[PDB]
Symmetry: C3
Subunit: 599 residues, 3 copies
């Protein structure tokens, strides 16, 4: 009996109290401790050396206790540790061993899930220092790390980075680095109040698979001029992605340095998410330096059905090389997104764009291999004052990109800055079903809507269709004489162009190329012979040697004659057609024509 009371009050007491489920005589005859052992929480490890529970709080460092919990549950083949609601659990020191090379705080372990219902905060020990809060590598050298498998972080709780600024731009900070990560995920968690490099990284240089970030919130994760750069989620393993997340920043620095997602391996996605306050939406990039685990190609890349207010570029495409590996990007889709450039002064943030074809990290524009991209069914808007806004800023070599059935309402459609890079362009396709908005009408003095500042263009299609007038623009499309143009189709629909001085401009007369197919409106002065009856009209100018046919876009105010409805050319570069003189006489008219070459 003394024994008994003593046993009951001891830590083995629950192990002596019997239990059978719902008094079911067919159920297991268990002890209370067995049922309690089905679950586990931080309270089961958050104790002093004598076993007495310790209350969390800002003067208590919870790190060792949470690590002890993870270590133990790992030793039993896994389970889910609850981080209890109603408390804030502070972290106040660095971890040890394999995660120390990563500035790690907690080491994650395979099959050990964290159900974060309460709050995890960083103590001021971390102020001005690097850190990665949760780390799944088990070695300081990621190349020598084991894998992290089957690790899920989820719940209604919060990771709060304490508001601390970076101490130096060279520092790195992260929330969750899953490492070489297979079937890992973060769901439901709010990451907030920091100055960090990433909130979550998935994978390592292509090693990993099936990692996801779903229904998470990321709020105010950049706050200082020290922060070098930020991507809220960096996706560095295949078959992985981000869905239904919320990203918000409020700091000015974020408008210049921060991106919501980086998709950096094949079969990755970003969908259904909302972004506000960031410079950039998503990078879609194959870095050769990251090609170890899944190959040198980033393919099956999906950015779909997002909502964004950004200050720089929505999707940024890239690929690059190292001394021994070449990176390639292909088979991309960008669809269903509704994006705007937020209110800002012209040139006050990185050049506004829906798609950017960006140079590598060294600024090289001649290393890229980007092709088979489909941009369809998106909307883009930039306010009228934002000069630096484009459907595409095409700033590095491009091996193909297709635009179908978008609505682009910004300053430029196609842009690259002159005297910068001279990209080599192939297979740029701009379908006629792209709707060009009117917000920037009257703002385009001196500017070309499609400003083709490239080394060369081949196998490309630009079908310009206006939907309102903008007589301020210099031209709808312009090719400098430095840009070769071949095996291409360039058209300017005549609607809303009657009063334009210039429609398409070929400063090197490139439209004469053998395999160039063009059409655009022009005004032409003609003069007829004096004969009564069928009578020829000829252009006064001789710069139509390339024209295969032309037709009238003008009415004929005359009763006594009519100019030709249609024209062809002559060897001397004049247009010629047969009109009709009811009464004879030399006629002189100025007519608006659709000039056509091989179309």
């Amino acid at each position: 009996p003394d024994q008994f009371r003593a046993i009951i009050e001891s830590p083995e007491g629950a192990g002596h109290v019997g239990y059978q489920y719902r008094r079911n005589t067919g159920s297991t005859m268990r002890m209370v401790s067995d049922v309690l052992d089905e679950r586990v929480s931080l309270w089961d490890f958050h104790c002093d050396p004598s076993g007495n529970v310790i209350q969390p709080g800002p003067n208590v460092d919870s790190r060792q206790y949470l690590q002890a919990a993870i270590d133990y549950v790992s030793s039993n083949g896994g389970g889910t540790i609850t981080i209890p609601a109603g408390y804030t659990w502070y972290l106040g020191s660095y971890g040890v061993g394999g995660i120390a090379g990563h500035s790690g705080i907690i080491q994650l372990r395979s099959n050990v899930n964290l159900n974060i219902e309460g709050r995890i905060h960083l103590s001021p020990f971390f102020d001005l220092k690097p850190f990665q809060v949760f780390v799944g590598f088990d070695n300081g050298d990621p190349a020598s790390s084991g894998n992290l498998e089957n690790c899920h972080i989820y719940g209604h709780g919060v990771v709060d980075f304490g508001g601390y600024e970076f101490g130096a731009s060279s520092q790195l900070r992260n929330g969750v680095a899953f490492g070489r990560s297979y079937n890992c995920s973060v769901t439901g968690i709010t990451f907030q109040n920091g100055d960090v490099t990433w909130a979550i990284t998935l994978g390592w240089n292509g090693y990993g698979s099936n990692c996801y970030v779903r229904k998470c919130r990321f709020i105010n994760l950049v706050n200082s001029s020290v922060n070098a750069a930020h991507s809220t989620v960096y996706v560095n393993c295949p078959y992985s992605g981000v869905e239904s997340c919320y990203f918000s920043m409020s700091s000015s620095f974020a408008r210049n340095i921060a991106c919501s997602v980086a998709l950096h391996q094949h079969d990755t996605f970003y969908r259904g998410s909302t972004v506000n306050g960031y410079c950039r939406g998503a990078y879609v990039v194959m870095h050769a330096a990251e090609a170890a685990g899944a190959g040198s190609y980033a393919y099956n890349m999906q950015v779909e059905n997002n909502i964004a207010v950004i200050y720089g570029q929505f999707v940024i495409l890239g690929s690059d090389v190292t001394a021994t590996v070449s990176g390639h990007l292909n088979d991309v889709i960008v669809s269903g997104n509704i994006v705007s450039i937020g209110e800002r002064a012209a040139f006050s943030a990185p050049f506004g764009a829906f798609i950017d074809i960006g140079p590598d990290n060294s600024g090289a524009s001649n290393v890229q291999d980007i092709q088979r991209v489909l941009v369809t069914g998106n909307s883009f808007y930039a306010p009228a004052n934002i000069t630096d806004s484009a459907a595409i800023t095409l700033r590095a070599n491009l091996n193909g990109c297709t635009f179908i059935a978008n609505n682009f309402d910004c300053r430029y459609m196609v842009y690259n800055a002159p005297g910068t890079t001279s990209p080599v362009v192939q297979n740029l396709v701009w379908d006629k079903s792209n709707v060009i908005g009117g917000t920037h009408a009257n703002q385009r003095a001196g500017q070309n809507l499609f400003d083709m500042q490239f080394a060369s263009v081949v196998n490309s299609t630009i079908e310009v269709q206006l939907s309102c007038e903008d007589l301020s623009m210099f031209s709808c499309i312009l090719f400098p004489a430095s840009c070769q143009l071949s095996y291409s189709k360039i058209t300017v629909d005549s609607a809303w162009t009657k009063s334009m001085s210039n429609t398409a401009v070929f400063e090197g007369n490139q439209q004469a190329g053998a395999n160039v197919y063009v059409s655009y409106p022009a005004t032409v002065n003609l003069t007829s012979y004096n004969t009564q009856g069928a009578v020829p009209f000829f252009s006064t100018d001789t710069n139509y040697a390339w024209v295969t046919s032309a037709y009238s876009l003008s009415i004929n105010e005359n009763l006594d004659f009519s100019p030709p409805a249609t024209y062809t050319n002559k060897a001397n570069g004049q247009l010629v057609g047969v009109g009709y003189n009811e009464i004879g006489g030399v006629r002189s008219v100025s007519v608006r024509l659709m000039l056509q070459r091989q179309v």
Copy 2:
């Protein structure tokens, strides 16, 4: 020892039985009560004044017990209360205090989540009365309410409204009113068997953020002629939305009064959901009267990837004004939806439409500021008998809407009823990539496919492309003389139009406008001069003064001559072109031409 047995059997007994997790000597030395205190259920509060548990059932009012649970868990900083599976928990009285002004039953509190695994039912005390089952306001006046934060309702359970009808049309009923709600959500729950105004409302007049409804079912939530109106989810805070839900109604009244979602603030979405039996899919509206918390603009509005069978309109756009605030709607995307009008008689429910540009609640059509809308990649079908079916019913002023790459298979493409409203239309863009289906071929006697019953149209594009014949229709597009038309492009592709009497009709001869760009087929009678050789042909009629060129759509059955291939006009309004008389003689022909103006 007596002490001991007594202590063990008392409510403090579990607090005396020790426990250590898995017999781990490094774990906390706890008591059983500590581990049990990690969770909480309704059973912990569902007791009489002596502490004896009460069984739920239809004669027991569970309200006070659930409120006591919520109140207590709130006092500890939050947690999750389980509503146990295997039981039905009846609610049978109104709450008290701040929620009484809202006819509230339960008051939600911040950080207190409800895991509803069992069923919550309404008792007949609520029959013929108003109610809001869960309310997150803390004050009868929402303007004086505190916020509700971090409150999630989730699980496999059910909210059942008892089937009771409304007592009066002026009454309001709701499931969950989150109030001024920040990071709140409903997930997994079935709402069923009612006559209610809303199932869920998010936010209050723009106050709130990050509220969501995900994987919920709403079944049979309207059942009587008393019910004034119904929106299953009303989204009245930004950065919030509905995803992957199921909405079904079976009552006839629902086909006339019910909508699945209302998106009423910026950065809101409705996606991936299935609707059956409703009048309407979604409202997308900025009410000036709701502009307090997030501004006067509804922007970044997304309706994507839904499946619907409805009886009225799929998406309804609106904006309005108050005495001192003006509401604006812009930057909308409607994409990927597959929608039909369900089987019904013509005119038996509100006018069928994929998009409706609706007048305000007073019927005013001259207050709206709706622009920058993209409608792309959707399908719409209405059965052939449904006269009242349109791609767009454009019934109020429109400042822009773009249609690209849709498939519309219904009676009308563009419609507004004559002698009703006379909307002022700008920037209506109907791209040629919109496919017009053939289900209503042969049903269109007396009707215009695009019936342009507007005050005016400017900066608009209508590119009509048929894909089968319908010789029953009066015209492909018709503008009454009352409609001004300027700075617009209107084309009718000739395919399937050879036998149409009328293609495009301009009852005020508006196609002559200086900045109108048109083309469409017409039949024209011509007569030539008698001269052998090149010889002119002239139209007998003189109503072609606006024509810039025309070309043959007809073969020439003759050997001895040919009419011109192409024509222009003369000051008197005749067409003229130069054909060829192999042998002389006056010729008279009737030819099908493509008439072109400035295109």
Copy 3:
């Protein structure tokens, strides 16, 4: 007192230890056993006849214990049974009763959910045998089965099929057969390591509703030449679907026999998922033999926003008949998908296709009723060597399908094999906004890009637009003389076609049909009369009786004359137009023209 110690140590002991939540005097005075009874796990039933717990393992058959758990929890109105983490639970025998007719192992029951956190494995008793692991039918004859309602399987755990091959091709294997299933779902689970027919089936012949598969992984579920066929999820009830799943196969047999999803009833969807290694993406089919529970029509079918690498066809459409029922498929949308054919030899797997219009299970091509399909905003790629790759393989009767704003980069656009089936085609619409890629340029000797090997085509549109040259192809579009063509529009844009010998080919001269609307480029030899001045030019050939107009696509190298810009025809089939001889003389020229008929 002896009593007392004995009571405490007995299975009723926890039922004597009091508990009150957090020492709250307003809370229920309960016993520990009451709180423990709020949850249930397999441990509560996994015991020998004396009540002693049994450890799971490969020599222990857990089946009877899990069934006993499900049976008991069912008897209390439901709940959720946990399958504990950290253990592998082996199944080693067949179930009994109603599921034996289905080779069932476990019988699911209404309102009883399974939270699978650990692993469920099949023991080698099942090697070479049929099985269905979880079965929701309650009768061997599904027609006589009751329903399964409100049953959810979810968690981070795993179902492992043991790697065992099928014993015979006629055998069936499944993971979860929900049966006649209403509000059932599988979420989060990994199904792996098998040779099975299905992983999950939803519904039975249209009976069921609201069943879903979300965030599941299916890995390596086909492994042998014995396996007849495989669909990873078969959706056989309405208002149901698959979202955000991952499907991977590695076996060669899978490339020939396996499909990820089968959508077989109305209001069903497949979205946001990633597929690798399969033959097929999704079937979308109405089998008449499955029409009992939800009617004879499959409508509101959605395949959207998926990523796939497959070896055969992405979406396969079908409908068929039985002796007394006819199946119909309509109102389908296929949007936003990014798909490729994986690296393979030509003809090494089933014919590669984005859409296939497939014959019934007997090979009949004359039973189908498929219409109102929208295919928009997708990308498709096949490597250049894959001869057997098409945007659409149209192999059975088609009543309509619309393609808008896709990017197809493969060998064929439209294909059917000659001398096979002769489908009857109506309402095939290929919009000009479909972008035709260049990967297969130079590979197309002897081949037609659009190979119209049909019995007949009516009410169809083919608007061919190239975006690069491919002079290897025989023609852009070809109709054999056996194919009737009427009430259709067929155009070939001239861009990149100057050097093509053949553009459009009508081997039966079908383009002359009264209601055929065509245009395409051709080279034509002309000769003029000798007259100075306006002078006629006539084609030497007489096969242009069908031409309504033609215009020049060639420049005029001459100074002394010009050919006509535009032409019409004469009764003898010559073209004729009026050019200009500055000086007289008979002229002879060869010109590239755009030939037009009724356009």
